[PDB]
Amino acid sequence: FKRYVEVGRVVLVTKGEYTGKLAVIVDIVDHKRALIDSPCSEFPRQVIRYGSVVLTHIVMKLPRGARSGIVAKKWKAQDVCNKWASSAWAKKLEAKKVRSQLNDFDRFAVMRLKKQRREQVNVAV
Amino acid sequence: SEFQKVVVIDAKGHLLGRLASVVAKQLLGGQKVVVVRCEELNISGHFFRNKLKYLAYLRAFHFRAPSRIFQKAVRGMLPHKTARGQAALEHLQAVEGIPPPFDKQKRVVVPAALRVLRLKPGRKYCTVGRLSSEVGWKYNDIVAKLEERRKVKSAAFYQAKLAKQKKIASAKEASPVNQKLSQFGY
Amino acid sequence: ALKEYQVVGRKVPTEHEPVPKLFRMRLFAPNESVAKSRYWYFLKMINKVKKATGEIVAINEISEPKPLKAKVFGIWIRYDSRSGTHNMYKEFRDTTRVGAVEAMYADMAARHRARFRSIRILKVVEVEKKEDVRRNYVKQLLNPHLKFPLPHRRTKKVFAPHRPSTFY
Amino acid sequence: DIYKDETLTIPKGVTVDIKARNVTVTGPRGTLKQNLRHVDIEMKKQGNTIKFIVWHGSRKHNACIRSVYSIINNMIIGVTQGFRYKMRLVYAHFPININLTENGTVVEIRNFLGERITRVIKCLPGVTVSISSAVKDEIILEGNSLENVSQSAANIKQICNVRNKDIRKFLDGIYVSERGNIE
Amino acid sequence: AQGHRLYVKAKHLSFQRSKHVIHPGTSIVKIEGCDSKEEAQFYLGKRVCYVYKSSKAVRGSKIRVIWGTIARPHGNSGAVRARFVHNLPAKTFGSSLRVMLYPSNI
RNA sequence: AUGUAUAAAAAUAGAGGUAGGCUACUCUCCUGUAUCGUAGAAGAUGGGCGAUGGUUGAUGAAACGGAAGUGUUUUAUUGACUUGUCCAUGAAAUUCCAUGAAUCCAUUGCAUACGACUUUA
RNA sequence: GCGAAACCACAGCCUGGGGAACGGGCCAGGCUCAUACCGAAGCAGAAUUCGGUAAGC
RNA sequence: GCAGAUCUUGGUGGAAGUAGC
RNA sequence: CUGCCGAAGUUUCCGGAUAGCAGAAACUCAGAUCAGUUUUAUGAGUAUGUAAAAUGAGAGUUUCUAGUGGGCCAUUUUUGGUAAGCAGAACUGGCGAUGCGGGAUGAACCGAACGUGAGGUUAAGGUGCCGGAAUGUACGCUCAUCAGACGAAAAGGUGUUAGUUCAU
RNA sequence: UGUUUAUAGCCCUUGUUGUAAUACGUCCACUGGGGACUGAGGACUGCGGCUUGCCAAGGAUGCUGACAUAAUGGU
């Protein structure tokens, strides 16, 4: 495998009011629940179930049961932010988020933009 | 969500009851549903369990083809005694394998009926076509032979499409317009 | 959702006894109405004190002091069954004492087909020491190498176009 | 148990690949292919150690893991040293004639207690049966698959079975005498 | 090519019924693309129509329309209740519908 | 009808792509909220510039596709369109939603509730 | 060619369940003595017996 | 003031072109 | 034809005379009484009856005048039973005069008792499809090769699941 | 393994900013939208609020159209 439920793994929340946020497992309550934390201020330390999260490939060195302050310092030290963003997963998600906000005028400018890019067809020319 | 005028469903790895229920509900919605690879339908439970279930049914016409087995399950989930359920049945075409008209068409799957997403790991399941092989169906061997023949041709088309796709993909970043206004997420 | 309620009650004063004894109990109930009713059941069940001759003098909900730290809780119950006499001790790992009882009420109903009325929790105590744990699964949960594969989640959006990854 | 893991040491075989739940164990003696996709046991390769781990399994799943490890160990032993089984024929009045065909692939038994019908037994693939000259009426079968050799020996023993006769009185027959590693 | 389609595709499922009693006054309409009751709140009050054709022509047009309006959601799966000027025929179960974007509040 | 638009297989408890010489690589998956397509009196009239390409229609075609191939391409020429970047006019007072064989026949027995049956004719 | 009468609520496939009959209307659906085989038994073999499997007869 | 009374009178059907003569 | 009232289906003596039930009329009253009411307390033996606080409703008559004057089921109580079942009484309501939602269906089961309609919200029961409504969430239990879903039945199980306790 | 903040930290207690925040419960005669179904009555009386008049206050009125010479209906 590539992903295991271990202390220090970075997980992505996919259910509830914290959907789309990033968190790192701090403690293993049980095979169905785990304690997570995030350096972001709006994300508090909480116990979440594995059904509401997906494990990313990023694993970061954390002592068991670290406090939020220590986790935030370790998160900055290990440069987890912009490392997940370097993955194509985050770029796909970020592109989807930016696409959702796009209004009608931006959509119109896109169609003209992708119309110009389409006619290139410089293959075998 | 969004629908299509005609739908081609690949019945490989789909549970019989779960797929039939979704198909029957879609038929009553006016959609036209075509189910291919009906001989790879899976049913939860041991192959001994379904053999006696079918053997009990053998003890009307006892159809042996896997496609007609699936149609029987779909038929029971429709008001076939009325005209509304009669018209729904005529909008369904269950076939074994992938016939040529549906060979070159997109085949969708129903995650609510997929065996992997619905069956506990390690649970014994039986394949409808494999189960029907020892009840009277005698075309399993040839149906597999065409299936591998279709797969080889399908794989060759995919390589041609993939090789062609590499050309536009390479030229996608060649055009500066892509990078110039990629701020829209595109 | 269950809530841990601290209920203190006593009999009304009379000429025979100027001052009555004070009885305090900790019990779990969704609302204070259930906790007061269950508390009166225990005193009658135990001290043989009539509800009509007593009163509830204090009720208080108790919150988990450390809900962000995983703990192991030992729970003793009494079972009313066809035989009508049983007692078992079980251990659960979680962060909230109330969460253990809710999980406790799940397994008795799942296994023994028991009800809320029959179970009368004598005592709930946090088992901090690893050695005191009598359950193998909790002991497995206490090793320094906790890393396991994902349990399957079996997750309208009908008619998916591509086969789902169904993997990590 | 969160995960029960059984660790085994990889032998000197050239290939110990277990990709796609198929163990293509190739060694100096030969290459043996086995299918393990019917067991829900995760196989992990790390250097010369092969670990079979079952996560959140039951007693039957744990039992299958032990059987899988034994099957893998038997396959590794057969691919490295091989399995050799020797059987001695027993006769009382009518001697039994044994003929080998297709390099021992087909074994014909004749004159079994006066029987006029010859019994033909086909050995499993990868197993060669020869008649040892050291011991009279001794047949030695060597192969890389222990299960195939055992199945072939059982079939030979079942073929030479006395019917409608006293076992205590008529002791004539063919049975496996000894079995072990070729090397 | 690309048509106009200033509306949203929808399907006529059934009447507002119990197990054995039907009420043709209210029809259950599935606005495809809407998947929950909260999403259905956008389409409340919009004008829904059933466009069909008859062989006899009136004013040189063979297309007839029954107009309606979406009233309230139905269930947790985004199906809505619609009341039409003429009750929709029972034979139009599974037939398509058009949900306009007017009246608009966006 | 209202885009009547989309062909891998495969595991899922791992697969595919990518690349090296099946052994070692890498990347992606975590669905389609994707991709293709889409601007004009439903899409006008010219001037262009720029592609000098693209979009296709028309026929003349060869190849492929058994299964239920009946459709995929390859085009050859020609016909136009082009909003790719721009301009100049035009489309409205509908001046608030409604939009030649066979049968009978004769023959025929080869047949037998009856025709049928059966050649000949 | 001449020509009735009895009878006539209406009907007309089954399978079940439907408690009172309910089928014709209602509800859910359709339209093992021998022997063959072996196993056990001293069953010396023959002679076979028993045990099941087995509806082929 | 009618739908019934194996109601009364009259007309007329299916059975039936049947049984049959 | 419509509308408004509307039983009883049985005490008691004995085919009956009563009564009860349901109406009509005349009377006197709301500062008067009444209640398938709950209490308080007196006593008497947790209950009991009586007397006097809460709650609700205006109450008490007198006269004569239609119909009923079977039961079924169900609840509880019951005495003996006795292959076991059951039988026997009594206690109490429902249906019998009553449609409606559910219960696959069904007269006794679960809700609910009815003018004609629009809208809303529920009960009982439900939300895979037939079928209106989550292929909802969170835990577990169950593999059957007859589950489950809606008496041979006690138990046995190299049958499990959780396991507990005791031995080492 | 044992070890005690190191070359990671964790737990407990006080202190701690503090009068923290949040969740939950409850309340506002606090407020901003969206949808649907009804419009009974027919001078004035009344109860209120603003400032004679005015008003969302003892029940719908305005502004428009198209079709009417079809739509709406009915059978």
Short mmCIF file of C-alpha atoms in Angstrom, two decimals, chain E residues 7-92:
data_model
loop_
_atom_site.label_atom_id
_atom_site.label_comp_id
_atom_site.label_asym_id
_atom_site.label_seq_id
_atom_site.Cartn_x
_atom_site.Cartn_y
_atom_site.Cartn_z
CA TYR E 7 -34.83 26.26 -19.84
CA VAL E 8 -33.93 23.21 -17.74
CA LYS E 9 -34.86 19.66 -18.68
CA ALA E 10 -37.27 17.89 -16.33
CA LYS E 11 -39.34 14.72 -16.19
CA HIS E 12 -42.87 13.93 -15.05
CA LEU E 13 -42.69 11.09 -12.53
CA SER E 14 -46.13 10.62 -10.94
CA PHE E 15 -48.96 12.36 -9.11
CA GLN E 16 -48.99 13.23 -5.42
CA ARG E 17 -50.20 9.82 -4.27
CA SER E 18 -50.40 7.54 -1.28
CA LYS E 19 -50.17 3.77 -1.73
CA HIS E 20 -53.69 3.47 -3.18
CA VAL E 21 -55.01 7.05 -3.60
CA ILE E 22 -53.82 9.48 -6.28
CA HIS E 23 -54.20 13.26 -6.45
CA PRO E 24 -53.77 14.42 -10.06
CA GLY E 25 -54.03 18.06 -8.97
CA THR E 26 -50.36 18.01 -7.97
CA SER E 27 -47.66 16.37 -10.08
CA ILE E 28 -44.20 15.25 -8.96
CA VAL E 29 -41.55 16.66 -11.30
CA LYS E 30 -37.86 15.70 -11.35
CA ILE E 31 -35.72 18.67 -12.41
CA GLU E 32 -32.65 16.80 -13.60
CA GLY E 33 -29.50 18.38 -12.21
CA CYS E 34 -31.16 19.07 -8.84
CA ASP E 35 -30.18 16.48 -6.25
CA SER E 36 -31.51 17.67 -2.87
CA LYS E 37 -34.38 19.62 -1.36
CA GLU E 38 -32.11 22.59 -0.62
CA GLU E 39 -31.13 22.75 -4.30
CA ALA E 40 -34.83 22.52 -5.21
CA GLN E 41 -35.43 25.86 -3.48
CA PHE E 42 -33.90 27.67 -6.47
CA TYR E 43 -36.55 26.29 -8.82
CA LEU E 44 -39.53 27.06 -6.59
CA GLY E 45 -41.98 29.38 -8.31
CA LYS E 46 -40.45 28.92 -11.76
CA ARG E 47 -42.73 28.32 -14.72
CA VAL E 48 -42.79 24.70 -15.92
CA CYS E 49 -44.47 23.63 -19.16
CA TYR E 50 -45.34 20.43 -20.99
CA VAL E 51 -44.74 20.83 -24.73
CA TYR E 52 -46.40 18.24 -26.97
CA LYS E 53 -47.81 18.01 -30.47
CA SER E 54 -51.19 17.17 -31.97
CA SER E 55 -51.83 16.08 -35.55
CA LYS E 56 -54.57 18.67 -36.02
CA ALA E 57 -53.10 22.15 -36.45
CA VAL E 58 -54.43 25.34 -34.84
CA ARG E 59 -53.42 28.74 -36.27
CA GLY E 60 -50.88 26.92 -38.42
CA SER E 61 -49.11 25.47 -35.36
CA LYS E 62 -49.11 21.82 -34.27
CA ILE E 63 -47.49 22.49 -30.87
CA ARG E 64 -49.59 22.77 -27.71
CA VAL E 65 -48.34 23.82 -24.27
CA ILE E 66 -49.68 23.29 -20.75
CA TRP E 67 -48.25 25.83 -18.32
CA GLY E 68 -47.57 25.25 -14.64
CA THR E 69 -45.57 26.53 -11.69
CA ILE E 70 -43.28 24.72 -9.26
CA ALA E 71 -44.76 24.97 -5.76
CA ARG E 72 -42.61 23.11 -3.23
CA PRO E 73 -39.98 20.37 -2.97
CA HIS E 74 -40.92 16.71 -2.62
CA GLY E 75 -38.66 14.34 -0.72
CA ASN E 76 -34.95 14.58 0.00
CA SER E 77 -33.86 13.88 -3.60
CA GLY E 78 -34.73 17.22 -5.18
CA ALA E 79 -38.04 16.22 -6.76
CA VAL E 80 -40.55 19.06 -6.71
CA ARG E 81 -44.32 19.49 -6.77
CA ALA E 82 -45.86 21.35 -9.70
CA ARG E 83 -49.44 22.48 -10.31
CA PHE E 84 -50.48 22.97 -13.93
CA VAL E 85 -53.30 25.02 -15.41
CA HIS E 86 -54.71 21.72 -16.70
CA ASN E 87 -53.90 18.59 -14.74
CA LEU E 88 -51.26 16.66 -16.64
CA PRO E 89 -52.53 13.46 -18.29
CA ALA E 90 -51.68 10.17 -16.65
CA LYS E 91 -50.02 9.01 -19.88
CA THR E 92 -47.30 11.68 -19.56
#
